[PDB]
Design a protein around this nucleic acid. Sequence first.
RNA 1: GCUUGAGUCUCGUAGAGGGGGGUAGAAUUCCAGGUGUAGCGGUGAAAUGCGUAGAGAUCUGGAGGAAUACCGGUGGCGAAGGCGGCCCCCUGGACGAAGACUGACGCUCAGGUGCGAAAGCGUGGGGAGCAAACAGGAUUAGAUACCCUGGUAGUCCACGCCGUAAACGAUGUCGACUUGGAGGUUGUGCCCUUGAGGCGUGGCUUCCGGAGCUAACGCGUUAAGUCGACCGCCUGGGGAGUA
Lengths: 218, 55, 51, 129, 100, 88
Amino acid sequence: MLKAGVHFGHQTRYWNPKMKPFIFGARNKVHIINLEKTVPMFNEALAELNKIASRKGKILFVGTKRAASEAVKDAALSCDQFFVNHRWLGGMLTNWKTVRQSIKRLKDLETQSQDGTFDKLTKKEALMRTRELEKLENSLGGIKDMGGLPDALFVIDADHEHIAIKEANNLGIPVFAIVDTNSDPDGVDFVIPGNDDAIRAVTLYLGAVAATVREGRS
Amino acid sequence: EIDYKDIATLKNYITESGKIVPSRITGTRAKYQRQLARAIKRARYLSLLPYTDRH
Amino acid sequence: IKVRENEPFDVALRRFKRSCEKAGVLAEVRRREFYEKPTTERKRAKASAVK
Amino acid sequence: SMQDPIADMLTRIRNGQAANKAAVTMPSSKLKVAIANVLKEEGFIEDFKVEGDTKPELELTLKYFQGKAVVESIQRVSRPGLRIYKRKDELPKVMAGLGIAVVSTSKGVMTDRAARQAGLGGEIICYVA
Amino acid sequence: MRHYEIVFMVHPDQSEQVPGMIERYTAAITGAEGKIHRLEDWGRRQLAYPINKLHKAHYVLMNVEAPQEVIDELETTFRFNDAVIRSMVMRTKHAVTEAS
Amino acid sequence: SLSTEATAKIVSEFGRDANDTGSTEVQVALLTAQINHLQGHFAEHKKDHHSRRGLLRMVSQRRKLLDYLKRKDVARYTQLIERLGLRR
RNA sequence: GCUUGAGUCUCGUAGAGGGGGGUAGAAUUCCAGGUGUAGCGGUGAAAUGCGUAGAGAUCUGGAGGAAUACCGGUGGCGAAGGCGGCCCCCUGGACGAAGACUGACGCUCAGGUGCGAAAGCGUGGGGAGCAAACAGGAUUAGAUACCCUGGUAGUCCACGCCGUAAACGAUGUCGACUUGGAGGUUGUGCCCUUGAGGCGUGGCUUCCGGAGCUAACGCGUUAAGUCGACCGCCUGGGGAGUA
Ligand SMILES: [Mg+2]
Ligand SMILES: [Mg+2]
Ligand SMILES: [Mg+2]
Ligand SMILES: [Mg+2]
Ligand SMILES: [Mg+2]
Ligand SMILES: [Mg+2]
Ligand SMILES: [Mg+2]
Ligand SMILES: [Mg+2]
Ligand SMILES: [Mg+2]
Ligand SMILES: [Mg+2]
Ligand SMILES: [Mg+2]
Ligand SMILES: [Mg+2]
Ligand SMILES: [Mg+2]
């Protein structure tokens, strides 16, 4: 049944009453979530997740923190999937139409990186323009092209991603997310208990989500 | 504490001058800081402890 | 209060007085009676001393 | 003070409901029961339960349908400070007809639909919808 | 019947009227069917500040069980007597022996 | 506020037996007791305004209790006030 | 009739809860004396004041009244007012742990009754410090003030009046119900007491915050949320809490 070796639970006091039903913890000043209730939430989780991924999966593996950002620009990034691994530039969904050209400048630039003007102008402008592009790259990588409108959303840490999720809620976008003992649920349709800032429950489920979009209907 | 006659245990809850030392410094509990003071005030009255360091 | 300082030195060494008396209970008792207004004082001394 | 228990029922409900509380209990009585009945028989609660003898205990199982609580509102209407009584023709109908009014009569605690058919009337205990 | 501590301190120049006093106060309490759960003639002791001119004065401890009546007239006898430079009858809650 | 010896004595003078402590008549009597005891405390002092509040409480408590009994068993009421000596 | 609502009973606990009496040290003022000598005191600066009859400074003895430093703390008690040295006596309430007793005896309460800071009044005391009034010295254009040097009622005690305060949490009392978090304080059960603790279980209290409520600020299990019983009060500002 279990597969999460050592993600057991996490998070001490800072608990959110509403996250009681998914708790059975009480180990030394910290809750262990209800392991045996998290897995029935891979059922439903990766299910309506894939059930749409074959209907065609457009995702947004949204998850930040200089401590798991790169481990999101991964097979999470790779597949039928888009992502954000830095500061969730607010209104990026709700104001996509303004931000849509924050994109044109990323391309119309890199498309021009080993092309267009580049080694020319000044060797001032140079890295003094790749700073324009470096900045853009993180926070606005995964976006690059959005071909199929943001369709579901998968987030690592419910509340830490206040804004992201809120926006979804506003635009009618499923929001699949894992929620720590401390975080507010109910912002999340398909809620996933368990730790949300340890190198494992990430990768595990993260990489496990990459494994279900990346395959649904050949 | 338990007793005002304990001047020995008591003389480590007062300064050179003889001022009671606040619970905050000694880290005592509430219920006892009072028992402490009272025992001190007793012993001062019975000339078992100076009110003052003016002698 | 008391420093019975001994042999090899010339300096005052009485940092003692900045541990109790002087501007302590002295600046205190020097003036306006107070009464119920220290209560208003010390009521800010905890609102402060909470953090 | 304990003075009005029927409001307490109506309320313990109203409250617990709003607290998405599974069940709820309280001191029982002939009267509390007759209503817990109509409440169930009209399908505002799952099912009641009286578990005692010397100190009886009414227990109601609450219901939640969509995400909401089933009982959208529950008010007193008569009360010690001010008793209400309606004749048959003057009986009230809640939410135009949806939801109901609990009226005690010379032939027992029954709804407004009920008492209206029975061709009588009594003390209108409370409103539910 | 209640208890009390009690601890009168006497003027040096009246030192050996202490045996007579103890003798007296106990004869007094015993007399009224009261026990006496501790006794301690601390003798001449040095003072923590000079009280009344003169330093060093003769202490006496007691721990009695006796009725609010003899304990009354004690406190007075203590006043009447201008040889007992201090005195203080105290709490109670149950007898006591040894300490000090 | 009255003695265990004394309070006991009266339970045992008024109730069915020691243990029948909460009998109307007993309460009333052990109140009535403390009231009258007190009459001499407030004889001196008098300005013991605070303690006084407690004493009235005792009277108004007793008063309601006496009222109860009367309604219940009138027979027991009259005996009581006679024996306790009040209600001139 | 019933026992959970309300009482009574038992042993304890904490407390500036009240009333009375006793007592302690520190300082101030004053009185007396040693030493000592021209200043001290006060302000923004001054002056008035005080000192050559020796001031202030210092030391010693004494008288008197008033308040209780340190403890002391969003600490504690009380219905509110409001209650802080220590000790005894008298006394009110609250809380906890066991079970035993009464058996709806309860909640509220117009009228009524009691209590009720400070000031103020009446007779007698009492008077160190403080200080309305008043006097003097200054500041100012003026200065009936703020500042200074003085200082009477008063501030203290008993007895009796007065009955008001932003007397406020500006939030009436009682009861039932409704996510949480970190403290403070006070009982009590259990755990190799083997840790200065470990886990529970009541009373009171502070901060923060969820629903919900609000005009908003904010309140939020100590409600300003959800309901009930009863009482008090509001109905534009001014006139007027006046006639
Ligand atoms: Mg003196
Ligand atoms: Mg002197
Ligand atoms: Mg008591
Ligand atoms: Mg009065
Ligand atoms: Mg007055
Ligand atoms: Mg007068
Ligand atoms: Mg003046
Ligand atoms: Mg008024
Ligand atoms: Mg207040
Ligand atoms: Mg709050
Ligand atoms: Mg709380
Ligand atoms: Mg309310
Ligand atoms: Mg008038």
